[PDB]
Amino acid sequence: NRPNRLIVDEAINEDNSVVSLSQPKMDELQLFRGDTVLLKGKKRREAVCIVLSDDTCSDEKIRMNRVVRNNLRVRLGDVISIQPCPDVKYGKRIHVLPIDDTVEGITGNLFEVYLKPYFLEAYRPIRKGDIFLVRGGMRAVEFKVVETDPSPYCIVAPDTVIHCEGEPIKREDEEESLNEVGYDDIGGCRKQLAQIKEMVELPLRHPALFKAIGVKPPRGILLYGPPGTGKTLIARAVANETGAFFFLINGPEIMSKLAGESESNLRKAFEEAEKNAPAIIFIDELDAIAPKREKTHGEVERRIVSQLLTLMDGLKQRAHVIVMAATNRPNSIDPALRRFGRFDREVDIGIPDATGRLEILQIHTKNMKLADDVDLEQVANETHGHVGADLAALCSEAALQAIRKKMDLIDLEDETIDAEVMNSLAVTMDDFRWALSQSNPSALRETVVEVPQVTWEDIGGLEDVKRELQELVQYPVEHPDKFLKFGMTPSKGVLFYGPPGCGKTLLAKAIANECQANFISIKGPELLTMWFGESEANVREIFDKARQAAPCVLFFDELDSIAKARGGNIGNGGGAADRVINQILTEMDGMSTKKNVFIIGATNRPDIIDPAILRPGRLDQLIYIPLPDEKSRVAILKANLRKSPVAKDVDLEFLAKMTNGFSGADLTEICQRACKLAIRESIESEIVPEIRRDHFEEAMRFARRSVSDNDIRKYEMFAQTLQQSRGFGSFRFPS
């Protein structure tokens, strides 16, 4: 038994002496809330930390940060021994000194700038011989214990004096640098990063297991994403956290060699990593190495591609090397590389969402000190087209602005800077706004994927439609047991038709938010570009991106916008079928029905929609969104007024009754006009900060009905023709 062995895993808190344990873990080992333990690992070394309460990690695993993982020489997946230590122990004299690998540039006091704001009111239990890292001064510097009283009996106390000599010492090869790349340095990638964690955990941490079994290990991992997403960061972090010898192979570095030298350089890079097993061979750019799809210009290019292909599939076990290649675009790769044995496991790393970029900002700003009025929530929202490298550049530029506001008048003309100035240099929002306005996003044209923040509370009315949407996309994904028993497959998608500006997009986004799945949206111009550009082959890429991002919903806005541009029911001498809808149907028919992917079709002119899409099998479920009723319009305003401060004066119920033929869009622009009037009257009166009732009274003058009465009749007759519930309404069984 020996219930003291726990699985080491990454922590969540950014502190130093923190251990995250579940309630039953301390309840089994008679451990309390505010106690200390003694973690013991390999190489005859121990560590003293503080246990904390957790409820998310696991049942029998320990969450330990990178700062303390390097102290015990224990990586992820290894096992350690934990035991309580209720013995009283105080600190008297702690002597520490940093290592010269990171102190080059520090001048002045070292206690007041790094130790005082870290050791006081913390009661961090230090251990003689441990390496702890502290952050501050827009950098990261650690410290090393060289001589102290024999451990245990080392706990920082307010009445403990600290003195240091001043010169640093050199480190050894036993410990790794804390400034390197780790799992805690990656943000905005959780679904993709977890797959890579679980994919290479066995062959790297346990190389001897695969040598004794017939299981084929994954020999190739291809990474996607626009340049700057962080593929190299993830590749280096996996190697640095799994104990594998990382070997970086740059793209242009090999191609820059002469004729025949590139072959030797690429070939010598494989057995070198094979000897240092386990190892990970990473390729920076692979589209620039093997673009053997359309280029095929030059014998040396083909020779390099063939050499790479030969060295790729020729890894018949031997070592335990895993090759992870990175590229920019999936189609820009040689198809011969995707053969089974060279590159079979495929990983697509997308642009982080709003909740992902905040983690990147927290990672990139953890070394510097910010002011109280600095919030990263608005920065992530305002930066919705940027990538991982974009935000690091934004942070660097924002940090540079603060230096410019103090270097000019202080004029520290010294060979090295002091640590007592940079700590006080707090970056404010004004520094970030200057850099945000000039940073050009590198990721704007390709489709962005989210899991939208809009929920059911933002949608007013449409209660009949909500239950229907929560009936076909949430039941097969949560309770499939009642589906395979009947032997019938679920629906492939549902089409939305009705008057424009009623919520055709809000329902699709809310159903994605509730189901916790990705959301891909295609607008009208996006569909029209591939028609006018005479290139309909881009549907396959959209469907592939949706498939491997499962679960996800495939939303097509105004699907009839391609038939409206060429007439409609009659139009020109052609019919109601074109190349883009052709390719969409072709890719939907061959789409995997067992996957969690879903397709949402939105249209405002259902009379011109091709019937070929509407058969049972592609899009059979049709839900009509009518104009909001009296109590449906009230909820629209109750949901739209949650952002702007409006007092109790404005009567929303009375406004809904007068707005009879008003769609959802008109009620939004009414509030927009009222708030614009409020802003204008505030600015004009500045030469008050609340929305009054006469604002809406004047804004109601220009209340234009976007939907007239002529199309209402057409929509209603179309709905009743497609429903056809008459005749069989009184159909009953005799006995």
Report the interface residues with a second copy, using CB under 8 A. Answer: 5, 7, 60-61, 77, 79, 104-106, 138-140, 198, 201-202, 206, 208-209, 211-216, 367, 392-393, 396, 399-400, 403-404, 407-409, 411, 413-417, 422
**Using CB under 6 A, which of 308, 459, 581, 619 touches ligand ADP?**
459
Torsion region of 63: left, alpha or beta (phi above 0 gives left; psi -120 to 50 gives alpha): beta
List Cβ<8 Å contacts ≥24 apart for 724-732.
none
Instruction: Report whether 397 contacts 435 (CB < 8 A).
Output: yes
Indicate the residue whose CB is closest to ligand ADP.
Answer: 388
**CB of residue 396 to a second copy, shortest distance in Å:** 5
**Applying CB under 6 A, does 232 fall inside the site for ligand ADP?**
yes
Which lies closer to ligand ADP via its Cβ, residue 317 or residue 396? 396
Pairing mode, strands 36-40 and 79-84: antiparallel
* Interactions with ligand ADP, residue window 583-642 (CB under 6 A): 636, 639-640
**CB of residue 630 to ligand ADP, shortest distance in Å:** 14
Which lies closer to ligand ADP via its Cβ, residue 117 or residue 356? 356
**CB of residue 139 to a second copy, shortest distance in Å:** 5
Half-sphere exposure of 512 toward its Cβ, with a 13 Å CA cutoff? Answer: 26
**CB of residue 66 to ligand ADP, shortest distance in Å:** 14
Write the interaction track for ligand ADP spanning residues 475-514; mark x where CB under 6 A is met and - where it is not. Answer: -------------------------xxxxxxx--------
Residue 88, helix vs strand vs coil: coil
Cβ-based neighbour number of residue 686 at 10 Å: 7
Handedness of CA 130, 135, 141, 147 (dihedral sign): negative
When CB distances are held under 5 to 8 angstroms depending on the partner's kind, the choice from a second copy, ligand ADP, none that residue 373 binds is: none
Length of the chain as a residue count: 735
Confirm whether residue 233 is marked as ligand binding: yes
Residue 667, helix vs strand vs coil: helix
Which lies closer to ligand ADP via its Cβ, residue 261 or residue 653? 653
**Applying CB under 6 A, does 98 fall inside the site for ligand ADP?**
no
**Using CB under 6 A, which of 41, 388, 493, 606 touches ligand ADP?**
388
Residue 265, helix vs strand vs coil: helix
Q: How far apart are CA 249 and CA 399, in angstroms?
A: 32
Burial of 471 (0-12, 13-18, 19+ CB in 10 A): exposed
**Applying CB under 6 A, does 229 fall inside the site for ligand ADP?**
yes
When CB distances are held under 5 to 8 angstroms depending on the partner's kind, the choice from a second copy, ligand ADP, none that residue 423 binds is: none
Which lies closer to a second copy via its Cβ, residue 178 or residue 305? 178
When CB distances are held under 5 to 8 angstroms depending on the partner's kind, the choice from a second copy, ligand ADP, none that residue 505 binds is: ligand ADP
B/e letters for 21-58, b = 16+ CB within 10 Å, e = fewer, are: bbeebbeeeebeeeebbbbbbeeebbbbbbbbebeebe
Which lies closer to ligand ADP via its Cβ, residue 546 or residue 670? 670
Structure tokens at 465: 């439609």
**Applying CB under 6 A, does 265 fall inside the site for ligand ADP?**
no
Q: How far apart are the first and last CA of the chain?
A: 66
Instruction: Report whether 677 contacts 671 (CB < 8 A).
Output: no
**CB of residue 203 to ligand ADP, shortest distance in Å:** 18
* Interactions with ligand ADP, residue window 126-185 (CB under 6 A): 185
Cβ-based neighbour number of residue 386 at 10 Å: 26
**CB of residue 439 to a second copy, shortest distance in Å:** 12
**CB of residue 135 to a second copy, shortest distance in Å:** 11
Distances (CA, A) of 567 to 509, 533, 570, 581, 672: 30, 18, 7, 15, 34
Structure tokens at 559: 């699907």
221, 227, 233, 234 alpha-carbon torsion, rounded to 10° = -30
**Applying CB under 6 A, does 231 fall inside the site for ligand ADP?**
yes
Confirm whether residue 298 is marked as ligand binding: no
When CB distances are held under 5 to 8 angstroms depending on the partner's kind, the choice from a second copy, ligand ADP, none that residue 229 binds is: ligand ADP
**CB of residue 61 to a second copy, shortest distance in Å:** 8
Confirm whether residue 197 is marked as ligand binding: no
Annotated binding site for ATP: 227-233, 328, 364, 501-506
Note the residues at the interface with ligand ADP (CB under 6 A). 185-189, 227-233, 360, 363, 388-389, 392, 459-462, 500-506, 636, 639-640, 664-665, 668
